[PDB]
């Protein structure tokens, strides 16, 4: 098996914990029992994590979901991205001290965030300063996948316009989100990742915990008086694109960029701190 750490960042009430439960088709979200789902908003940004082992035929994935309650939920959210960047850097510090592997384990314990989902609220306008300030600070140290939260709150015309608008803003602000084009292996990787950077992203996602029967078939979705949106239906939203990307295809590519780019940059920086290298 292997480890995988995913982080969700966004304002409270964007479907973050519901989406995570849809990605992994399991109750892996931190909120799992009764009133624990109805949680109070902390006064500062707190970092919380929960661990689950997901087995898929010999592929024992050791999953850790990390959420950031209190982000963008205060009156004054100034510098609220710094506690999240601090957490990411200090997981690099854990790995930096353990890859020596004095314990001689076949697998070094990995707690670094391999994938960070940032949820953008569907406002129909341009991006918020909080959205920009977070990504331009964090895209340099983690893999950020931008998603549009609650995609069922937009029509086809609104959704196509909002995706273009966010995509143009991220390209104009030099925000290199995953998959970064610098790390395409070959032309086969450039071809598939251009379609993702230029069409499939931002993933307009919809999460749901409940199942309904729509014309004979059992489907995940949300039930409105006027109809039921099917979550795994590409004509309704783009959840399945996010799922085949993160889980089915680029799972390892996410961990590789984390190790060979972000962690290596941090490790090379730390070698030059505290007076520099020890004499040897």
């Amino acid at each position: 098996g292997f480890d995988f750490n995913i982080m969700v960042v966004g304002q409270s009430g964007l479907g973050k914990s519901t989406l995570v439960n849809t990605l992994f088709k399991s109750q892996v979200s931190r909120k799992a029992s009764s009133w624990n789902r109805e949680e109070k908003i902390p006064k500062t940004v707190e970092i919380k994590a929960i661990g689950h082992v997901i087995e898929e035929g010999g592929v024992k994935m050791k999953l850790t979901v990390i959420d950031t309650p209190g982000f963008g939920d205060q009156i004054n959210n100034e510098n609220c991205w710094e506690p999240i960047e601090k957490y990411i850097n200090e997981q690099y510090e854990k790995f930096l001290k353990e890859e020596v592997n004095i314990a001689r384990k076949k697998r070094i314990p990995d707690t670094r965030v391999h994938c960070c989902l940032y949820f953008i609220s569907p406002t129909g306008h341009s991006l918020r300063p909080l959205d920009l300030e977070f990504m331009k600070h964090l895209s340099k140290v983690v893999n950020i996948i931008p998603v549009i939260a609650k995609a069922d709150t937009m029509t086809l015309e609104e959704k196509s316009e909002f995706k273009q608008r966010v995509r143009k803003e991220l390209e104009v602000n030099g925000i290199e989100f995953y998959p970064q084009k610098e790390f395409d292996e070959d032309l086969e990787d450039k071809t598939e990742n251009d379609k993702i950077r230029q069409e499939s992203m931002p993933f307009a996602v919809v999460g749901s915990d409940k199942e309904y029967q729509v014309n004979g078939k059992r489907v995940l979705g949300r039930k409105y008086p006027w109809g039921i949106i099917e979550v795994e239906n590409l004509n309704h939203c783009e959840f399945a694109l996010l799922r085949d990307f993160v889980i089915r295809t680029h799972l390892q590519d996410l961990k590789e960029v984390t190790h060979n780019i972000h962690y290596e940059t941090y490790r090379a920086k730390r070698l030059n701190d505290n007076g520099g290298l020890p004499p040897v």
């Binding site: 009156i75 959210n77 029509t155």
Partner: protein, 265 residues
């Protein structure tokens, strides 16, 4: 007959769409865009007067919006520009009562404030609590669950129960409605607070009958359908029915309390 309506809320909560849905006019257009298109470096308060024929009867409607409210990383004191606008209109009326020759009285006090609540499905955000707790003694606040089509009937139901639980908890005083047929709409409103509204200016054919709503691939959210949202309850309680009672509470409660506080020093 005049009326001053104020909308407060984040960008993208459908405020421009709901206002143009209530009055069936292009109050926000490419010429005078919505508040989300007029955001400056700091929070501003802007007004726009417009003439409306409501079923053959004219209406002098003044919309007051707050472009930039809640849209910044640091929203500290973003309510203060709204307080300054409302209290300066109270001072404008008090200086008119104290005139020697007070023949004609300009009344530009804000008679009603629609405060949009983002449809989290959880509760009220600290911004919502702090705003309503700082303006409920200065204006008639009517909380709205914006974009009600965001929530399923079950989510919206307990969302309402939570918002009222926190209204009552923080001792918030929202505008309440005071003929037994007039007491018929009061009972049907108290059980539906806060009103969850949907806005749209688009008409589409739904099984022959053309209804105004929002078309999704899986269904159509209908704006004038009481089983989809509370837009009808809002429009009936705002223009047709209790508009004058909103005007009277402003003069007799909030303006009288501003005066009693101003002159005490």
């Amino acid at each position: 007959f005049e009326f001053t309506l104020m909308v407060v809320g984040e960008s993208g909560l459908g405020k421009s769409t709901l206002i143009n849905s209530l009055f069936l006019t292009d109050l926000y257009s490419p010429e005078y865009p919505g508040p989300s298109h007029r955001i400056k470096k700091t929070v501003q308060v802007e007004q726009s007067k417009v003439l409306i024929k409501e079923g053959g009867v004219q209406l002098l409607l003044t919309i007051v919006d707050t472009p930039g409210f809640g849209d910044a990383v640091d929203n500290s004191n973003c309510w203060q520009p709204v307080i300054d606008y409302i209290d300066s209109k109270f001072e404008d009326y008090l200086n008119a009562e104290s005139r020697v020759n007070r023949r004609q009285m300009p009344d530009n006090r804000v008679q009603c404030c629609l405060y949009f609540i983002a449809p989290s499905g959880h509760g009220l955000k600290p911004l919502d609590i702090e705003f309503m707790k700082r303006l409920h003694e200065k204006v008639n606040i009517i909380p709205l669950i914006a974009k009600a089509d965001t929530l399923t009937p079950e989510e919206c139901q307990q969302f309402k129960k939570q918002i009222m639980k926190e209204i009552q908890e923080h001792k918030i005083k929202i505008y309440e409605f005071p003929d037994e047929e007039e007491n018929k709409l009061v009972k049907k409103i108290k059980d539906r607070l806060p009103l969850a509204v949907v806005g749209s200016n688009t008409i589409i054919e739904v099984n022959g009958k053309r209804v105004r709503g929002r078309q999704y691939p899986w269904g159509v959210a209908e704006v004038e359908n009481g089983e989809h949202c509370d837009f009808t309850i809002l429009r009936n309680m705002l223009i047709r029915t209790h508009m004058q009672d909103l005007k009277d509470v402003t003069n007799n409660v909030h303006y009288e309390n501003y005066r009693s506080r101003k002159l005490a020093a």
